[PDB]
């Protein structure tokens, strides 16, 4: 089973004795999530960056007070598209042989770096896949984050900044990336993630939604908590995401083979249709990766698909791409 | 000090031996909030409907698993504008001399029923104040809620139903209430509130976002928990509000002297500017109720303003009406 919520979810020192930062050994895997990167680099996750969904959920909860439903939702979503369902292993970065024997195509078990499954365009501190590297910290983008913190956050990162910067990264991609895609699951995650630094990288004794540019660079670039960093004083994730959505209302869509041809996708879900997004993710995205699984793979798919459904906070009705039972 | 978060926030029986439903005595106070109403009728709050901030915050958390920031934000906003800052008492309903000696005008201490401070138009199950009773359960509107739950919820109330019903109640008021006002604070809370029934009134052992009509009537009409009701399995309030907002985009505004004259207000806060909403609440709303507090009043104001600010989940810069 996925973990339950924390028993004691108060703020506490998480940059402590048993969870020191350490530099990367060769073979250590890091990817497009500064959240999971930091947990790994503090040993809340295995330090090589290869983990079970359960390990990942306990980590985000213990290390950072990510809420339970959000942790279940994101973990099992990633695992379903990016992880190996038999070994129950997911890489938080590049495709690796340490996740075990692969399933048939088109499932690719590419880990969190796999473009177009979880990872997607218009990341705040990462370049679009189309340009070549979709997971490494990018200094130009980060210093754009700083600018926007200066203009909009009086020098801090907060949900007002998130609003502006989220729109700016969208415009950037429309303008430069002929393969820009911003529909369905990526349309969804791209908004919440911009709340995460304000809600979770801010020291929990303060919990005031103003993230400083030191704490920011530390998380985004080095996967390192600040000294004496306390986690937030309660479980949360994308609280305030409506601030980011309403700052510059966008319709989901994509460039159509060239820059500046952003075209609305009338079949995409959006924020008014979360159950449609859940249903698409299950009955199209996951299903296309595993169209005709063997008996063993089917039972693993169904188990993980169960756990995924549990993390859908809107409720919705479970769908069953391989039948009930 | 405001209570902090529950120590143990898991689901548990809350309709219990310690907390039985009991019919109203005469002079028992109930108001426009089904949540506070139900806690008072179960003895989580004082049964007569008059309570401290600290009592209200413990109630909503213990009885229903309202989250600690949302409890502080809502509780100290209400008290600031509707409660007695000297006696530390707020009526969850009508103005009552039971909150103690009134401060001077233009402060009203009208309790939760006070139109235009916290209470406002386009409620799900309460009529707009213009029509003359802004607090009693209204059966025709609940019937619309039942209908919309059949149409969009498969028989149940859920976030998709909340999205359609919130827009329809807006349209209703624009079409019928020449005094419709839907800006600033009321614009913000009217959305979050339509998530509550699906997030909070749903038995905690399911937590599946689908509220049945038996349980909805219970809460909204009789301020009664279902038999064997468990509270939610974690602390929450307005999870999913973005769904309700995007279902039918609306700007803040009001009718101007007549029906079908909805006039957007570009000076209002909206969901993109929660710090401006906080600001305007403190600097215009509270300030105008207490333009010149005596030294004692001013002390109590600042103390409660501090607490209100703690509850502002977006963060924001604290603002100071009295320095
Ligand atoms: C939320 O609301 C609060 C109000 O509830 C906002 O705070 C208020 O901000 C306004 C506008 O900025 C300030 O107005 C300015 O006040 C100064 C003088 O202020 C001094 O005197 C005030 C009066 O004293 C009271 O009590 C005495 C008796 O003891 C009475 O006689 C008085 O009449 C008053 O009742 C006093 O209140 C002030 O104390 C407060 O502020 C100080 C900080 O300065 C704190 O230490 C205190 O603790 C307390 O908070 C203070 O001692 C005026 O001189 C200003 O006039 C200038 O600007 C005008 C336009 O705004 C212009 O018309 C004038 O001609 C003059 O313009 C000139 O000066 C400007 C620079 O000041 C130049 O920029 C300009 O070009 C030109 O050169 C001005 O009216 C209030 O003081 C302040 N009130 C409080 C209680 O703090 C708050 O800003 C709001 N928050 C947000 C985010 O909006
Ligand atoms: C429980 O809650 C409900 C809803 O809030 C409430 O019923 C509502 O009562 C109000 C107040 O009377 C009604 O408002 C009127 O609506 C009609 C429109 O007819 C509608 O019919 C259906 C509903 O059956 C609507 O859904 C549909 O959209 C139709 O439009 C308007 O014509 C009325 O306008 C008159 O009164 C206004 C307010 O005073 C004036 O501003 C306006 O100019 C009109 O005034 C004219 O008549 C006046 C006398 O009435 C007089 O001054 C002049 O002659 C003047 O020219 C009005 O806005 C609303 O429709 C009701 N909704 C329902 C029944 O679904 C219940 O009463 C409430 N229960 C309680 C409080 O106990
Ligand atoms: C709140 O609760 C409601 C209801 O449970 C949820 O609403 C559902 O929303 C989903 C979006 O994810 C809708 O799914 C979409 O359905 C499309 C088809 O629409 C029409 O056909 C449907 C098929 O009905 C079948 O089954 C019924 C009986 O079971 C038979 O009558 C029919 O013959 C069919 O066999 C109808 O149900 C529907 O009314 C339409 O006419 C489909 O093409 C899309 O791909 C997608 O799957 C679904 O339609 C909604 N169901 C209802 C009853 O409204 C909502 O998500 C919940 N919200 C939350 C937040 O929990
Ligand atoms: C629960 C397991 C989680 C998974 C599986 C996950 C996965 C991911 C993935 C795949 C991305 C890349 C999306 C893109 O293209 O930008 C991402 C981005 C992001 N993640 Fe996570 N994440 C998880 C938890 C967290 C946590 C706990 C945090 C911080 C508290 C976090 C913070 C962020 C941020 C801020 C980004 C955007 C990075 C940027 O745009 O520069 N994530 N995450
Ligand atoms: C924290 C203290 C609280 C205060 C001070 C408060 C206050 C109020 C007030 C004044 C209103 C009337 C607004 C209007 O509709 O005109 C309201 C409405 C409402 N409240 Fe609360 N409330 C609190 C907690 C809760 C809780 C814990 C719940 C649990 C679900 C809740 C559920 C609701 C709902 C569903 C409405 C909408 C009623 C309708 O539209 O018919 N409230 N509340
Ligand atoms: C980190 O992300 C930034 C943001 O995009 C990347 O900077 C961009 O780098 C590209 C090529 O390296 C620059 O493109 C060049 O621009 C000229 C026109 O000015 C064009 O004619 C050339 O053909 C070429 O495409 C682009 O200007 C530049 N953008 C900004 C805002 O600096 C950077 O490459 C990323 N770092 C990586 C991928 O390591
Ligand atoms: C829940 O955890 C919190 C934070 O860790 C506890 O409060 C602290 O407990 C630690 C013990 O490791 C003490 O060193 C601190 O002095 C406490 N901080 C305070 C009181 O601000 C709290 O005791 C825990 N609650 C329960 C019921 O175990
Ligand atoms: C999600 O996908 C599954 C599999 O495609 C759908 O189940 C199929 O539905 C068709 C049409 O009713 C049946 O003829 C097949 O036998 C079903 N295959 C099964 C059950 O393995 C399922 O209905 C989809 N769910 C939704 C809500 O669209
Ligand atoms: C937290 O609350 C519950 C009581 O509501 C405690 O355990 C629950 O209640 C009984 C007691 O064992 C169990 O049968 C239930 O399964 C428990 N509910 C759960 C686990 O959701 C629990 O022990 C309390 N405190 C701690 C620290 O767990
Ligand atoms: C609709 O709004 C108007 C105007 O805001 C209210 O008019 C008030 O009337 C009362 C007494 O009848 C006076 O105390 C106020 O001075 C008036 N205000 C203004 C600005 O003119 C009106 O009463 C509201 N209608 C109802 C039925 O509540
Ligand atoms: C982010 O921080 C900024 C600056 O501290 C806050 O923005 C200020 O908000 C006030 C009133 O809301 C306005 O003067 C400007 O919009 C801002 N000032 C400046 C200098 O930009 C903002 O409220 C913060 N947002 C959150 C959610 O904390
Ligand atoms: C982008 O899509 C185009 C057209 O579909 C195709 O050439 C290629 O697969 C993609 N290009 C890159 C650089 O990924
Ligand atoms: Mg990306
Ligand atoms: Mg009302």
Swiss-Prot record, chain B:
One function term, GO molecular function aspect: peroxidase activity
EC number: 1.11.2.1
Family matches, as Pfam families: Peroxidase_2 (PF01328)
InterPro entries (UniProt xref): Chloroperoxidase, Chloroperoxidase-like_sf
Catalytic activity as recorded in UniProt: RH + H2O2 = ROH + H2O
SUPFAM superfamilies assigned to the protein according to its UniProt record, in alphabetical order: Cloroperoxidase
Glycosylation sites: 8, 138, 158, 179, 283
Disulfide bond residue pairs: 275-316
Family note: Belongs to the chloroperoxidase family.
Function: Aromatic peroxidase that oxidizes aryl alcohols into the corresponding aldehydes and then into the corresponding benzoic acids. Oxidizes toluene and naphthalene. Catalyzes the regioselective peroxide-dependent hydroxylation of propranolol and diclofenac to 5-hydroxypropranolol and 4'-hydroxydiclofenac. Catalyzes the regioselective peroxide-dependent hydroxylation of naphthalene to 1-naphthol or 2-naphthol via a naphthalene 1,2-oxide intermediate. Catalyzes the regioselective peroxide-dependent oxidation of pyridine to pyridine N-oxide. Halogenates monochlorodimedone and phenol.
The protein, known as: Aromatic peroxygenase
Organism in which the protein naturally occurs: Cyclocybe aegerita (Black poplar mushroom)
């Amino acid at each position: 089973l996925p973990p339950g919520p924390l028993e004691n979810s108060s703020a506490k020192l998480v940059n402590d004795e048993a969870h020191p930062w350490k530099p990367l050994r060769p073979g250590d895997i890091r990817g497009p999530c500064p959240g999971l990167n930091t947990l790994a680099s503090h040993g809340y996750l295995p330090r090589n960056g290869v983990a079970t969904p359960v390990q990942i959920i306990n980590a985000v909860q213990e290390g950072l007070n990510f809420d339970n439903q959000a942790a279940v939702f994101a973990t099992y979503a990633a695992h379903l598209v990016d992880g190996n369902l038999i070994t129950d292993l997911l890489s938080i970065g590049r495709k690796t042989r340490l996740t075990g024997p692969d399933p048939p195509p088109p499932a690719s078990v590419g880990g969190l770096n796999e473009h177009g499954t979880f990872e997607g365009d218009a990341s705040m501190t990462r370049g679009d896949a189309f340009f070549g590297n979709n997971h490494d910290f990018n200094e130009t983008l980060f210093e754009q984050l700083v600018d926007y913190s200066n203009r909009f956050g009086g020098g801090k990162y907060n949900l007002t900044v998130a609003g502006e910067l989220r729109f700016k990264r969208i415009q950037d991609s429309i303008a430069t990336n002929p393969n820009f895609s911003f529909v369905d699951f990526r349309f969804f995650t791209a908004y919440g993630e911009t709340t995460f630094p304000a809600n979770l990288f801010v020291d929990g004794r303060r919990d005031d939604g103003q993230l400083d540019m030191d704490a920011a660079r530390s998380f985004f670039q080095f996967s390192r908590m600040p000294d004496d960093f306390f986690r937030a004083p309660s479980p949360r994730s994308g609280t305030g995401v409506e601030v980011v959505i309403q700052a510059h209302p966008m319709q989901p869509g994509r460039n159509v083979g060239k820059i500046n041809s952003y075209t609305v996708d009338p079949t995409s879900s959006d924020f008014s249709t979360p159950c449609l997004m859940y249903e698409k993710f299950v009955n199209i995205t996951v299903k296309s990766l595993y169209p005709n699984p063997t008996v063993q793979l089917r039972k693993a798919l169904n188990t993980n698909l169960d756990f995924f459904f549990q993390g859908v906070a809107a409720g919705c009705t479970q769908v069953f791409p391989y039948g009930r039972d």
